[PDB]
Structure 1
Amino acid sequence: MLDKIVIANRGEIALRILRACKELGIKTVAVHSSADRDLKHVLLADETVCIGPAPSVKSYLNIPAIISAAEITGAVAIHPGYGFLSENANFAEQVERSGFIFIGPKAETIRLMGDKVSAIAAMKKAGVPCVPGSDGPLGDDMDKNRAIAKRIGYPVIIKASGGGRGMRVVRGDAELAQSISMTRAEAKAAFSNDMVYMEKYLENPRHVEIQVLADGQGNAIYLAERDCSMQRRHQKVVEEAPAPGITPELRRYIGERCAKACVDIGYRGAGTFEFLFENGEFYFIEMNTRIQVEHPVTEMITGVDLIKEQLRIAAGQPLSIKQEEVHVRGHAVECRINAEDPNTFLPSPGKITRFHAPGGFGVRWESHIYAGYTVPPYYDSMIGKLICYGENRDVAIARMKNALQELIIDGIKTNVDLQIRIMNDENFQHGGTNIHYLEKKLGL
């Protein structure tokens, strides 16, 4: 078992990872910016190293600084969390070249799945259902590009192969040329890569993703699914597991092909296969080769600690469970808590004056915040995650409502009130709302 790791992240997920390490007797190294000296996980850690000033580029994206910390503390591995460098192939590779364990997949695998064209080709090859598309990049020949639009059939969507998002719906030949030029130029200026591709556009899909784990002994398993349809500007607001309306037959179908994909591609560690789900059909869109924000819902309904499994896998230990031992039991819902303005949706940083966490049965609170903690302006608005579990969806929802009424966070503006409205929303209670629902309810 791993002796000592660098938690190369901050806020809630850093605390999340810290608790996993403590449980397993792993020593913790908290790397942090000068603005994060008083983070809960920093104050609990065994060793702390300050890697640079507030802005991410000189702290949480500073590759040399994070590797030095590892070297000077005698750490053996680096857990990158989500965001920051977690999907950075160059970083994972430098971690490996320097002789530390990247808690995550092989760099090569990260690079394969971080380009959408090559990711879709691999999934398609492994029998995972994808969206009909160009199946390869588009050149600058508009006669050919129109032929591809007709073959797919309108509406189509144009998409950068790298990845905020940068996409364009097209509904006829007239808008096609101009939508390609613009998408192309916006990917050149963003990821330096001007490659684009075309997919069939789905009007009312839901977002359903499959959690997987794969170890170094050939084992690969799926841990049911999550629905993260409730979104704003393509940012998830609420996630839940299992996904309403997914039968055990569908679960077993899409899960088995996700696991087979892992085997074919030599995947390792925790991963998420993201799908658009419409008319009872799954269509692949993206693989996240990392732990995700919304992993605690899958944990509540399976009993499997996903972070601890990451640490075990990275150490050479085989998965603690087989597929046959994974049972979906009950139902969990996650509400993201954001230090945000209720009318602008721009971050509202500031000093938390009073704080109270909810508690009780089936209630799990994932956050670093505390009374007197200042939320800095330099990072994401998500200060916390509230997860509620119940024997069925209706119980999970009802616990959420009460847990929210109890959550106290004074001194800054938060989305607690908005979450409460969504939990009271009669369509959410029916289940199965699409990815556009939250924006149509708010009028955005």
Structure 2
Amino acid sequence: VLVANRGEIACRVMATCRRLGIKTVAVYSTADEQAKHVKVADESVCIGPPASVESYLCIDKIVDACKKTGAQAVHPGYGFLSENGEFQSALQKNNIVFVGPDAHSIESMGDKIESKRLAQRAGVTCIPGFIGEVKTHEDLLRFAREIGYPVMIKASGGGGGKGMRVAYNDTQCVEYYDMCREEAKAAFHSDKMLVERFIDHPRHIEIQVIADRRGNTVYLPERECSIQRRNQKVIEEAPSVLLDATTRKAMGEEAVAMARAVQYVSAGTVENVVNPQKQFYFLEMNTRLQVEHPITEEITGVDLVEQMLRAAADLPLSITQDDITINGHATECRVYAEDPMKNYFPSIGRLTMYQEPTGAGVRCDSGIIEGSQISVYYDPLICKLSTWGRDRAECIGRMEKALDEYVIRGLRHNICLLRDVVTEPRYRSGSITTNYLQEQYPNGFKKAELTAEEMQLMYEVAACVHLKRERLHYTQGTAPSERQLYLSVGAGQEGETPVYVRYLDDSHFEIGASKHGPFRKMEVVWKASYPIIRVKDGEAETVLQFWGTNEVTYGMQMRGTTFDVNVMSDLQSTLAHFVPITEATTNTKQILSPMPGVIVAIKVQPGQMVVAGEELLTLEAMKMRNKIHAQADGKVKEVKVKLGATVEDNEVLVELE
């Protein structure tokens, strides 16, 4: 079989075949000649230029290419043009298997409209509210009391969240109807309002579904997709805390009942919104192969890929709802190349200087091997880290530990945000909401700080590392074994903390306050000039990272955050006070081209916003295109140098004001 995706899922598929003993083929674009899925595959064929359209999206190339492998079936994947009719039609022109759902169900359910029809076909507890215009305030109050809901005032013709106000009491109902009619009459030319059961605070619970072309339909355990930034989810978890069998059993039964309704074959997944009063709302249903199943597979072992490919041959499944159980729970997170602390700045075109994944009792699905890069015209996802567990505390701690052991170098990421979110006591309380993120991050993003004991431990580990790397340079036995260091982070030596060290063995020290002070005998295990640093005092265990140094300042990472600790002796400490600290030039002015050349491409527009790290234009000289970018600034005021202006000579190409 041949896949249709070029991400982690492709690798997953070419991995499921291992046990299924199925030879696999994987196509690629020109830029992806070095992707892992190309070498993992048994066969590879090029699909032209790497721009999205020609790459994979070029059905004609793809369907035509499906004539040499011999494979009797070809996976549709989950992205790009997966589950598409124009594609399903073409594949049934050449009479080949789709390894996916049937057309009629797909167009009946994935369609934007008429989904409410199928929803109300059997009702299935669809959105509740007075179905019609509320012409009077009396009707609005009466229908609000009917269910005593937060009103969910929404315009009949309005969409996207415009014309919506949340009413909690009758006076609020009247005032918000008065505002809503005024807003909607001006904005959408419709005064027709509707009132529905608004949700106190949503959790966005999701229910998984599987089926088959013969029978033995099964309901998979539900999942969580509460956390969501810009309508994109981050953290997922299958057995949500607010789970009662009274609801859940009916959820599975109703999902299976809806399944046969449209004769769905390859079930996508069911979407719900759940309030603390344990309701459910079947709508916004999915018909795509969601790849958040690893979590469910961790709590079940139900290999969705194997079962769906088995059903693609008109055979029933190998599992029934009778044996499906729960053996704990799993947590999954997504690693993006999106720089959060810097206003969510995108960082692309950077191959991995060097990276190593966490592999301690955890699972990681990724398509980015060492020496791989991310283009702008693709998904900036790095890895899909998922860890098995049985208890919240157990599963989370694992994630905590596994986050710190993920070495990524060569480009930014959002691991700090994931770490801070997981460590927050609100997240460990047990329950969350969908507005959780912006509720806990009002102004931008700011990572939480360190407690006193954590900073002390970081100091101790830094001193141990300094001594260990110092002993390497000495010759033969003429080496020291004890010092007294003065650690102080910050440019002003904030909190000078005297530290000792003794190095009793290769990976054991006798850290103390100073000489003639009680000693603790911690342990540090670190390979010289490497990232990972495992330190264990008593029971507590920590993992820190070592970035680099200039022999007075150490670049060490603590809880997914970079710091610069200063490790200096008595003389250096007493002398660093008497050192000039000059301030570098802070110039917000025009930028000039360093060398002569020709401008062939421009990226930014005249007199608009500019952010740090953004490419601006590209000169070509002596057969070579450079690319001077914007180091750092907010905006510009200038006149653009036009295309093909072979002038340069250190002119003012862009002027920053």
Matched, 1:302 2:310: no
**Alignment partner of 1:284: what SS?**
coil
Q: Deviations over 1:277-305 (max 9, x none)?
A: 11311112312112113111010001111
Matched, 1:440 2:439: yes
**Alignment partner of 2:294: what SS?**
helix
In 2, are the aligned partners of 1:28 and 1:47 still within 8 Å (CA)?
Answer: yes
For residues 61 and 262 of structure 2, what CA distance do their matches in structure 1 show? 31
The equivalent position to 1:81 in structure 2, one of 73, 77, 80, is 77
The equivalent position to 2:98 in structure 1, one of 95, 102, 117, is 102
**Alignment partner of 2:68: what SS?**
helix
One-letter amino acid matched to 1:438: L
Q: State TM-score, norm by structure 2.
A: 0.59
Q: Deviations over 1:36-84 (max 9, x none)?
A: 2211111110111111222212223222222112223233333233232
Q: Give the count of matched residue pairs.
A: 414
In 2, are the aligned partners of 1:67 and 1:95 still within 8 Å (CA)?
Answer: yes
One-letter amino acid matched to 1:71: K
In 2, are the aligned partners of 1:352 and 1:374 still within 8 Å (CA)?
Answer: yes
For residues 271 and 211 of structure 1, what CA distance do their matches in structure 2 show? 7
**Alignment partner of 2:53: what SS?**
helix
Inter-CA distance 33–157: structure 2 relative to 1 (3 Å threshold): farther
**Alignment partner of 1:378: what SS?**
coil
**Alignment partner of 1:374: what SS?**
coil
**In angstroms, what is the RMSD of aligned CA positions?**
2.7
For residues 308 and 56 of structure 1, what CA distance do their matches in structure 2 show? 29
Inter-CA distance 152–437: structure 2 relative to 1 (3 Å threshold): farther
Inter-CA distance 295–156: structure 2 relative to 1 (3 Å threshold): farther
Inter-CA distance 68–241: structure 2 relative to 1 (3 Å threshold): same
Q: Structure 1 residue 217: deviation in Å?
A: 0.8
Q: What stretches of structure 2 of length at least 5 have no aligned partner?
A: 145-150, 166-179, 445-657
Higher RCO (Cα < 8 Å, 6 or more apart): 1
Q: Deviations over 1:360-410 (max 9, x none)?
A: 22x111112222111222111212101011121221111110110111111
**Alignment partner of 2:37: what SS?**
helix
Q: Structure 1 residue 203: deviation in Å?
A: 5.2
For residues 169 and 18 of structure 1, what CA distance do their matches in structure 2 show? 48
For residues 281 and 298 of structure 2, what CA distance do their matches in structure 1 show? 26
Inter-CA distance 145–168: structure 2 relative to 1 (3 Å threshold): farther
Matched, 1:358 2:358: yes
Equivalent positions of 1:31-430 (< 5 A) are: 31-132=27-128, 154-157=151-154, 166-168=160-162, 170-171=164-165, 172-177=180-185, 180=188, 201-202=198-199, 204-278=201-275, 279-342=277-340, 343-349=342-348, 350-361=350-361, 363-430=362-429
Inter-CA distance 64–169: structure 2 relative to 1 (3 Å threshold): farther
Inter-CA distance 177–397: structure 2 relative to 1 (3 Å threshold): farther
In 1, are the aligned partners of 2:83 and 2:100 still within 8 Å (CA)?
Answer: no
Point out the more displaced range, 172-181 or 55-64: 172-181
Q: Report % sequence identity.
A: 43
For residues 176 and 95 of structure 1, what CA distance do their matches in structure 2 show? 46
Q: Structure 1 residue 116: deviation in Å?
A: 3.5
Q: Structure 1 residue 160: deviation in Å?
A: 10
Q: Structure 1 residue 181: deviation in Å?
A: 7.2
For residues 23 and 328 of structure 2, what CA distance do their matches in structure 1 show? 34
In 1, are the aligned partners of 2:35 and 2:369 still within 8 Å (CA)?
Answer: no
One-letter amino acid matched to 1:393: R
In 1, are the aligned partners of 2:157 and 2:188 still within 8 Å (CA)?
Answer: no
Inter-CA distance 101–401: structure 2 relative to 1 (3 Å threshold): same
Q: Structure 1 residue 258: deviation in Å?
A: 0.4
Point out the more displaced range, 400-409 or 47-56: 47-56
Aligned to 2:4: 8
In 1, are the aligned partners of 2:152 and 2:195 still within 8 Å (CA)?
Answer: no
Q: What stretches of structure 1 of length at least 5 have no aligned partner?
A: 136-142, 183-196
In 1, are the aligned partners of 2:207 and 2:222 still within 8 Å (CA)?
Answer: yes
For residues 199 and 307 of structure 1, what CA distance do their matches in structure 2 show? 39
One-letter amino acid matched to 1:256: E
Inter-CA distance 166–35: structure 2 relative to 1 (3 Å threshold): farther
For residues 334 and 29 of structure 2, what CA distance do their matches in structure 1 show? 24
Q: Structure 1 residue 235: deviation in Å?
A: 0.2
In 1, are the aligned partners of 2:163 and 2:183 still within 8 Å (CA)?
Answer: no
Q: Structure 1 residue 215: deviation in Å?
A: 0.6
For residues 418 and 123 of structure 2, what CA distance do their matches in structure 1 show? 38
Q: State TM-score, norm by structure 1.
A: 0.86
Inter-CA distance 198–263: structure 2 relative to 1 (3 Å threshold): farther
**Alignment partner of 1:277: what SS?**
coil
In 1, are the aligned partners of 2:26 and 2:41 still within 8 Å (CA)?
Answer: yes
Pick the structure with more strand per residue.
Answer: 1
